[PDB]
Design a protein around this nucleic acid. Structure first.
Ligand SMILES: [Mg+2]
Ligand SMILES: [Mg+2]
Ligand SMILES: [Mg+2]
Ligand SMILES: [Mg+2]
Ligand SMILES: [Mg+2]
Ligand SMILES: [Mg+2]
Ligand SMILES: [Mg+2]
Ligand SMILES: [Mg+2]
Ligand SMILES: [Mg+2]
Ligand SMILES: [Mg+2]
Ligand SMILES: [Mg+2]
Ligand SMILES: [Mg+2]
Length: 231
RNA sequence: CGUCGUCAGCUCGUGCCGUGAGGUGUUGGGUUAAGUCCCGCAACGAGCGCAACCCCCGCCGUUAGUUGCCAGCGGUUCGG
């Protein structure tokens, strides 16, 4: 499922803005840029993909977490492929530790999923009506993938654990496996199942994400091949 | 009942921070008569307030035509 010629997308970056705790996954500092060693990645993917495949094999649920620009749309696709919950735009504080309370915003969502599912009564003030069509969109803008998350997840798969320290901190507090792909600017000790590598190259973000999702399909029966590897 | 003050404010529930008082939310950018609304955000909602629903005034319609009114023909002591 893995590769060895994945070294043709990323092998690391981020020039001397590093976290010293990451040095045990760094091979050399060449063009001003810290270069990640992938023999450290290959062993680690063996751990992570051992965890991911074994997790879906028993009915798990991985909350995929991506927020930044270079990983915005790709995390939407890959989580929808495996039918997995994603958080796309903003990570709402408490989403995990205050789950039974933010989930109270998807019930309001399903409400406007029924209301604007013709008709209940649309014959109630259009102002009072189009008031809601904006509240509808907003809920979809932030709860589009979290809605399928009906219960506190079994693990989370984040794109950037520094950029997403809030989500990590909550999951760590709930004894939730924190699995993540991370480059030279993050804390290995905070990640339960690590994937050392670039998290800014879309050419690399999609790679370790798209063919990680592929592994999730084969663990819940049957395979599919093509996912969006847009150029 | 007066008053501050019809001033835009005062708080709660869960989560987060803090040894603790307490903080966050309610701060920030913009907008409003307004914590009014928008965008942002370790917060997510909620309540009391603000607004609204209520009464008078301003235009039009329906429904009614005496004790009210008189547009147009008839009288008319000349007062519908
Ligand atoms: Mg970064
Ligand atoms: Mg005051
Ligand atoms: Mg509290
Ligand atoms: Mg202090
Ligand atoms: Mg505490
Ligand atoms: Mg408090
Ligand atoms: Mg206050
Ligand atoms: Mg406060
Ligand atoms: Mg205040
Ligand atoms: Mg303050
Ligand atoms: Mg006022
Ligand atoms: Mg706010």
């Amino acid at each position: 499922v893995k590769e060895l010629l994945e070294a043709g997308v990323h092998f690391g970056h981020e020039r001397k803005r590093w976290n010293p705790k990451f040095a045990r996954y760094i091979y050399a500092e060449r063009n001003g840029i810290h270069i990640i060693d992938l023999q450290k990645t290959m062993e680690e993917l063996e751990r992570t993909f051992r965890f991911i495949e074994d997790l879906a094999m028993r009915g798990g649920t991985i909350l995929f977490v991506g927020t930044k620009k270079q990983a915005q749309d790709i995390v939407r696709m890959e989580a929808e492929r495996a039918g997995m919950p994603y958080v796309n735009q903003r990570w709402l504080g408490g989403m995990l530790t205050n789950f039974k309370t933010i989930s109270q915003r998807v019930h309001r969502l399903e409400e406007l999923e029924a209301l604007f599912a013709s008709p209940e009564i649309e014959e109630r003030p259009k102002k009072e009506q189009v008031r809601l069509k904006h509240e509808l969109e907003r809920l979809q803008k932030y709860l589009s993938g979290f809605r399928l998350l009906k219960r506190l997840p079994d693990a989370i798969f984040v794109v950037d654990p520094t950029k997403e320290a809030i989500a990590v901190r909550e999951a760590r507090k709930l004894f939730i496996p924190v699995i993540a792909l991370a480059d030279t600017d993050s804390d290995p000790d905070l990640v339960d199942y690590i994937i050392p590598g670039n998290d800014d190259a879309i050419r690399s973000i999609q790679l370790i994400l798209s063919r990680a999702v592929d592994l999730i399909i084969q663990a819940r029966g049957g395979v599919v091949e093509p996912s969006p590897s847009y150029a």
